[PDB]
């Protein structure tokens, strides 16, 4: 398939085995078939399939099971749905301009640039355009967009 990794954290953690049950449950949810929870550090990295399963559906599963699933921020950074850290920018106008540049691209359907965090989410079709062109565009401005990942 096109496996996309999702970076989230759990809040709950009964301790002994509830995470362990949760892992098995998610392996049977739908398009997700990799669990990478570090119960030690307290992170759930997994690999879902966005065209079949969606993060909020996941959340519903976790909520039903009786935990909180909250993404770190980094909901993926993967295929179509990438994210970038934009360095050099330091003004709302620069944000607006970047977002204009992005939206100017045929494929990109929603961008969301968040300066307080200093990353940008980008939602395009990974065939008609590619990240390097976006990079080039912002290089032409004079920013640096590095996949924060």
DSSP string, 8-58: EEEE---SSSHHHHHHHHHHTTSS---EEEETTTTEEEEEE-TTT--HHHH
- Is 6 annotated for ligand binding? no
Q: Reduced to 3 states, what is the DSSP secondary structure of residue 104?
A: helix
**78-149 and 1-77 share a CATH fold:** yes
Per-residue three-class SS string for 117-149: CCEEEEECCCCCCCHHHHHHHHHHHCCEEECCC
Q: Where are the domains of the chain?
A: 1-77, 78-149
The answer to whether the Cα torsion of 10, 14, 20, 22 is positive or negative is negative
Contact predicate 65/14, CB 8 Å: no
Fold topology of 78-149: Alpha-Beta Plaits (3.30.70)
**HSE-up of 89 (CA within 13 Å, CB side)?**
28
Helix (H, G, I), strand (E, B) or coil at 7: strand
CATH placement of domain 1-77: 3.30.70.100
Q: Which SS3 state, helix, strand or coil, does residue 110 take? A: strand
């Amino acid at each position: 398939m096109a496996p996309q990794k999702c970076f989230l954290q759990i809040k709950g953690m009964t301790c002994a085995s509830c995470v362990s049950n949760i892992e098995r449950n998610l392996q049977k949810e739908a398009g997700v078939l990799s669990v990478l929870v570090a119960l030690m550090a307290g992170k759930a990295e997994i690999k879902y399939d966005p065209e079949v399963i969606q993060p909020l559906e996941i959340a519903q599963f976790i909520q039903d099971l009786g935990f909180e699933a909250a993404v770190m921020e980094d909901y993926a950074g993967s295929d179509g749905n990438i994210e970038l850290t934009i360095t050099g920018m330091t003004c709302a106008s620069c944000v607006h301009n970047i977002e204009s540049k992005l939206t100017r691209t045929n494929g990109i359907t929603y961008a969301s640039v968040a300066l307080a965090t200093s990353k940008a989410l980008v939602k395009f079709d990974p065939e008609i355009i590619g990240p390097r062109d976006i990079i080039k565009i912002i290089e032409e401005i004079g920013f640096h967009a590095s996949l924060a990942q």
